[PDB]
């Protein structure tokens, strides 16, 4: 099936938005979810990672970007700040357990950061 994304928009830059990646089940603290970018034109790349509650961040977004879980919503969050231009992009979230399988993509959801 597909993870439910949600929290996407349009924002100024150095705006924030927070994405969210829901799924459905009983086992969703067993889950690693990741998120990915893809910006027009351009190859997807990965973009943040939450292993059980490690967290992991590509070098750029780190320090700007938190990811983040609530077990009992089955939910994980990126909080995104100061976001730039450079930051448009679908973001598509990933689910697996730790051997690779419960696999599962959200669809993918819009975030645009115009310049000023």
């Known amino acids: 099936v597909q993870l439910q994304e949600s929290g996407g928009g349009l924002v100024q830059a150095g705006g924030s938005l927070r994405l969210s990646c829901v799924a459905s089940?009983?086992?969703?603290?067993?889950?690693?979810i990741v998120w990915f970018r893809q910006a027009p034109g351009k190859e997807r790349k990965f973009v943040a990672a939450?292993?059980?509650?490690?967290?992991a961040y590509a070098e750029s977004v780190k320090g700007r970007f938190t990811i983040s879980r609530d077990n009992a919503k089955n939910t994980v969050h990126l909080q995104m700040n100061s976001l730039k231009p450079e930051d448009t992009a679908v973001y598509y979230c990933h689910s697996a357990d730790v051997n690779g399988g419960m696999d599962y993509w959200g669809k993918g959801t819009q975030v645009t950061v115009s310049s000023h």
């Open positions: 089940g009983r086992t969703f603290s067993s889950l690693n």
């Open positions: 939450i292993n059980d509650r490690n967290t």
